[PDB]
Structures are given as C-alpha cells and as structure tokens.
Amino acid sequence: LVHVASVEKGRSYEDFQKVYNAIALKLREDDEYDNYIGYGPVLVRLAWHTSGTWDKHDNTGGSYGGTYRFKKEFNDPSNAGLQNGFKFLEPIHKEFPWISSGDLFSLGGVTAVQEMQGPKIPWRCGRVDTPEDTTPDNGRLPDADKDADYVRTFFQRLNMNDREVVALMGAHALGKTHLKRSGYEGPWGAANNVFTNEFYLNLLNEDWKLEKNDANNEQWDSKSGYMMLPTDYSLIQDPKYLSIVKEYANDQDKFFKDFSKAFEKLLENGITFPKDAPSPFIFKTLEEQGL
Template sequence: MSTANRFVPLASRAVFSRRVMLGLVGSAGVLGVAADLHQRRDGYRGGNGNGNGRSTGKLWTPLVAGAPIAHLAQVDKKYGESDYQAVYNAIAEKLRDEDEYDNYIGYGPVLLRLSWHCSGTWDKKDNTGGSFGGTYRFQKESNDPSNNGLENAAHFLEPIKKQFPWISYGDLYTLGGVTAVQELQGPKIAWRPGRVDMPEDTTPDNGRLPDADNGASYVRNFFDRMNFNDREVVALMGGHALGKTHLANSGYEGPWGAATNTFTNEFYNNLLNEHWTLEKNEANNEQYNSPKGYMMLKTDMALVQDDKYLPIVKEFAKDQNAFFKEYTNAFQKLLQNGITYSKDSPVFVFKTLDEQDL
C-alpha cells in the first residue's frame, strides 16, 4: 500500500493504522440530507451477542414525503441516567485496573480513537456511516487498514457489553470515547443514547477515514464532508495530545507529546514551539520529528501552515479552557452526526470516578 493510502488515527495511545485520524470531531444531532440506502426505519433494535440485529419488520420511511431519511434514536425508557452511569463506571474502573497496556499509556487513547473511527465514516450527502449502527463489529469495517489496532479497544469493551447486554454497540463505542476523555482529565462531554445495532449490509465502504500524508486543503475538504468548520477541525485535532503512533501498525512512530495519557492543550504548544524536521522513518514514510522525540504528521503540521488554522492553534495553545469548550461541542457533534433525536430524548453528563469519590 502506498503512503498516500495510509491512515493514521488521531488520538490513540494504542496501535495505529495506516491512516491517521486528523482529529476528533463532534456535534449533536446533525441530520442527513439523502435517503438511507437500505430504507429501514425502526427495524433492527439492538444486536445479539454476535452483532446480528433482529428486524422488527418496520421499514425506514421519509419523515415527510420526498424528504431525506434520518436515523431515529430509539431510547429504551427502562434505562435511565443511573444505568448509563454504571456503564461509564465499569469502563472507567477497567481503565484503572488495566493501566499497563501499551507500556503504561493505558487504553484511554485507543478507546477515544475507536469512538472517532466509528463516527468519522459519516457522509452528509447520503447519511450513511457514522456511529448510529455500531457497524464496527462487522469484519468489513473492523478489518479496514485504517482501523489497525482498534481490535484492542473492541476487546477491552466486550466484557462491558456482556455485563450490560442491553446497551447497543454504537452507544457502547461512543460512550467508551466519552469515558476516556473525561477520565484522562479532559472536558465533560454531553452524551445521548439511542443508537441501534444495524445489520451488516449497512456497513460503510472502507476509505472514509483520513489520510495522514496531506496538507491543509485536504484536511478542510475532508472535514467538510462531516459539516465541520475550521474552528471545530482544529479542536478535534487536539485529541492528538493522547497516545502515540506505532510503526508496525500505522507506518509512523512516536508520541505527539510528553503527556500521552493526560488530555491537555499540549498538542498546540508543541506544534508552535518545538523544532520540527521532516524526515523519513524506518517505513520510508515522511513525518516531522523533534529533538525531544515527539512526532507530527503532515496533517498535523497543516494547522500551522494554513493562515486560517494558525490563529486558532495559537488561541488554544494559550487558553486550554477555550480548547476544552470547543472540543466538547465538536466531539459531541462527531458522535451524534446523522442521528435524529426527539425533543424529550435524554442528554447525560457523567460524573468521573474521582467526582464520585468526593
């Protein structure tokens, strides 16, 4: 595979894929603008343990004749905030218990990356992909070269699924990312349930995740597919404060900074202040290296090479609160892209384990 086709995930402390995710994206409840290709409505409520959904026999129909079809969130009212907080707690406690993963970086970054990759396949043109259907559980998506290493996050979450079989995979994967951000000292992320495990034929085609070997024009066009503006793009890329790349899995090697398991604005400060040299690594791929042993991808450096991105990078480097505020909204948007929520659909903001210990 050529270097142009290698995806490298963004905020993953775990093993990375051939392509790097440019950042973590988000917004709440963006509607799709085209008919769902499979024309199903509330069928396929939840999957069984093998990830195979069961049809209720109802078909997807337009909300209004001739209008786009949207994925409608389905919230089981038997389960409330305390039930989802219990799922959050189980994930967070497992993060603490299994902290030796990846040389004590831990599972947080790879959980964040899983939630990004599950959501980052969304396309506003036809409302396909995204987090709604939990389709990462199928081999077509999980075996995408862009998802190399994410099996570690999926295996980490599988015991949680067995403990709470009522939660959909789409909800579990996205809640895992929210838990990782919050437990690694990042901002609070408002999260909404209601994703439905869809059948295998709704899995998006491979190739929708970003390519690390490109500049600012590519980055801007890529995120436009998911309705993100420049400010949101720069915020989402800040997730690269977490984790590191691994040569064997992504074709790139090294961390973006020193605090690989603490969510901060370090990524922006490193972009601005480190001395970067473009070099070829052992896989013959070009990456930017600093004397401290940090690395940046070409898509990362695009943020300081572009006149519109650069002022935002400088703002977030100076003001972590501004970064956290923008990231909160953008990441929530990413996780909810393409999903339609009713007016009474719940929104949860979970307490961290530390907050519950007070």
C-alpha cells in the first residue's frame, strides 16, 4: 500500500510553525513532569514509537496513519508511559484540529529535540489519518534485553544501517528508564533534558557493572548513578558499533548531523512525497524567534 503525503488543506510553513510554537511553549510551561525532566524525552520517544512500527517489507505501520490514537497501539506494553506524551499533545490538537495525528506525533518529536538544544530536524507535513483496522499489531518495537546481533537485525526492518542505528540510539541521552514502565530503572546520564552526545561518552567512560534491578532484569550500572540497557551496551561489545560510538563521542557536530538525518528518515519511512510537495520545513526554535 502506498501512502502519499497530502498537505493539510491550504496550510503552509507558518501554520506548522504555530503548532511547533504551541508545543514548545507547553514544553517550557509544563516543566514539573517526571521529576522536572519535563516532557521533551517522552515526546521524542512518542515520535519514535509511532514511527518505529514500520515494516519496509509491506509498508505496514509507520508514522503516516497516526494509529497510536487507537487502543490496540496505545495499549501496546512496549508503549507504556507514552500516554503522557499523548495527553500533553491533546490541547495542542484541540487548538489546531486541522493537523493530522501522524503529523502531530512526529512534529512533537522534532519540536522536543530542537527545544532541548538538539540539531535542527527538517520535517515534512502531509501524514493522513488512517482507520482503526490499519493499526499495526503489538510486538514491532524492540526488546531491551538483547545483543548487538538482535539490534542490527531489528533495525534492518526499519531500513537502518549501523551508522543510523548508533546515531538514533544517542537519543538515550534523554529522560530515563522507569521500572514500572519497562522493567529497567535509571537515567543514562546527567544531561537528560538537553540533547547532547553524552550517551556515547558515558558508554565509553563510565565504569559499568552488570547488576540486577528490582524487577530482576540485568542492566549495566555506574557509580555515578547512570544505567545502560543491554541493547545500549551492545553498541560497545560489537566492534562495528564501537567504532561509531567512538566517532560520536569525539564529534558532537557529526552526531548532530547524523542524528538529524536518521531521525527525519525514521519519521518519514513509508511516506511517498509527490514531486511537487513542499520542501521540508526547518522550524525556528522559540529562542530563535525571541519567544
């Protein structure tokens, strides 16, 4: 099935910058969430999980249809906690009812990365809501207790290569694991609502110990109070991933550029953009606008 991007009728860059801005202003205002981490990280994760159900083999799932709004997908155990991002976006959608669900979930992620001082992420509009029966089944998002071979094979289904995977995983600088949500507990670093390459630095430089958490799952822990999932740790066990981790630990701009590309790509898998579609938008941050 082909999903052709269809611009919300009559809308242009300024309309979507207004949505961006409303997201960004609420991100600033609603700062208490998650022990003052704020909603940035969970909005990034929402964008990823709504996009990461995609299957390149048959174009099922993906960001286009905004299917997270249906109960099968919002109740996926893999999505536990993302309801907080959805609830955040609800008043945004009420103010701007013309935006599609897929466009809003993906734009939330872009807006969060940028407002957290991450790279600019070009973003294209035109996702169109699809019906409840187009919601992908549970089980397409990745397990965390696995090794590098798992990770590499997993991401082939999203058409991501080693560099794209390692770049995307850098988003694990953000937020934290929550025991009741995933069976893992703890942040990955200190700067968890500012977008930086800290994930890579911590992987290489902390002294990690393989421990069991209070849900009886193994995770890697440091004396600084940070953690890594087994799938995170796999990025330094595998020599191909390790090289790339070292690259990003040593070049913040390179990480930014590669993350931006990979994240846009993730958010756009499955969508066909007509030849005469608008160019991707690059939204100004609130800071850049003086707001």
